């Protein structure tokens, strides 16, 4: 039968599942058609994390429900600040995984700390891409324009934006 396994890139795969399918096997029907490897996989429906050996029947997961597929990575603080004349703003976020609805989770791999500034008029244009994807990928670097990216059902929309120097 037809279950949907959502990805944290906006891409939710409609896998075709049987209630007598073991968890190990979902994690495989996944790796099969989308490349993911079995030991990274973290699937999270209904507020619970899924134990390999358990059959999906073991979790009462019927047709057209949804788990959430989420990758943690073998291999702390995102901060956004604006600061001006009238005053100053600060939103601080941290990487986590949601259980009830993981599509809200914050992924982060940090290779080096980054500290960059960008024109707001540009960012204001950029966030319009919300209306194409639940989620947005963001790539920052001191050596190059930052990438912002909404994925489409097969394809994507990208915004490269150069940081300011001073």
């Amino acid at each position: 039968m037809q279950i949907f396994v959502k990805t944290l890139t906006g891409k939710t795969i409609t896998l075709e599942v049987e209630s007598s399918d073991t968890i190990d096997n979902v994690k495989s029907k996944i790796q099969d058609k989308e490349g993911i490897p079995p030991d990274q996989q973290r699937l999270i429906f209904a507020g619970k994390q899924l134990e390999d050996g358990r059959t999906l029947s073991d979790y009462n997961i019927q047709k057209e429900s949804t788990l959430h597929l989420v990758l943690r990575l073998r291999g702390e603080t995102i901060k956004f600040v604006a600061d001006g004349d009238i005053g100053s703003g600060s939103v601080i976020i941290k990487p986590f995984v949601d259980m009830e609805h993981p599509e809200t989770s914050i992924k982060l791999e940090m290779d080096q700390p980054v500290d960059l500034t960008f024109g707001a008029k540009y960012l204001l244009d950029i966030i319009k891409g919300s209306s194409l994807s639940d989620r947005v990928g963001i790539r920052l670097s001191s050596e190059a324009p930052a990438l912002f990216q909404f994925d489409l059902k097969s394809g994507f929309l990208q915004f490269f934006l150069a940081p300011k120097f001073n």
Partner: protein, 163 residues
């Protein structure tokens, strides 16, 4: 000889939103494996880049690459005729002067043929994405949306810090 059919004109209407508001023109390279589009903003600080696969159209057929540079402000107008769930269809010939846009909805209900006259825009495609970036994060797009939106009230310059 392009004939490309979105099952719902909403989508393409959305995608063009992305360009509107920050870029005037855009070449639209159609290929046998789909559409891709590049536009640079005026101050050359922002590049918008778009990729659309065959799997994104209801039907797609383009047995020859063709380029369609177009006025976005013009094209969006034409896209208000959209109603959002109608079947949009782009069509073009060997050497194109006009691209034809073609809406039609439930049945033979309604049908509306439009033409956008194309302009010569010089193709200077950029390939600026790096292999490695210091840092990478994903997060709900409207969360981001909210943050950018709030901090824009205080300051012309939002600055990001990861640690």
């Amino acid at each position: 000889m392009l004939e490309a059919k979105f099952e719902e004109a909403s989508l393409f209407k959305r995608i063009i939103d992305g360009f509107k508001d920050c870029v005037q023109l855009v070449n639209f390279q159609c290929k046998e494996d789909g559409i891709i589009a590049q536009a640079v903003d005026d101050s050359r600080v922002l590049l918008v880049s778009l990729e659309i696969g065959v799997e994104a159209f209801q039907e797609y057929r383009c047995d020859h690459p063709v380029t369609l540079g177009m006025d976005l402000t013009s094209l969006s107008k034409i896209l208000r005729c959209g109603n959002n769930t109608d079947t949009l269809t782009l069509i073009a010939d060997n050497t194109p002067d006009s691209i034809i846009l073609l809406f039609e909805d439930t049945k033979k209900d309604r049908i509306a043929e439009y033409s956008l006259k194309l302009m010569d825009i010089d193709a200077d495609f950029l390939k600026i994405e790096e292999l490695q970036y210091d840092s990478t994060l994903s997060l709900p797009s409207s969360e981001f949306s909210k943050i950018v939106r709030d901090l824009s009230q205080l300051s012309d310059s939002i600055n990001i810090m990861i640690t």
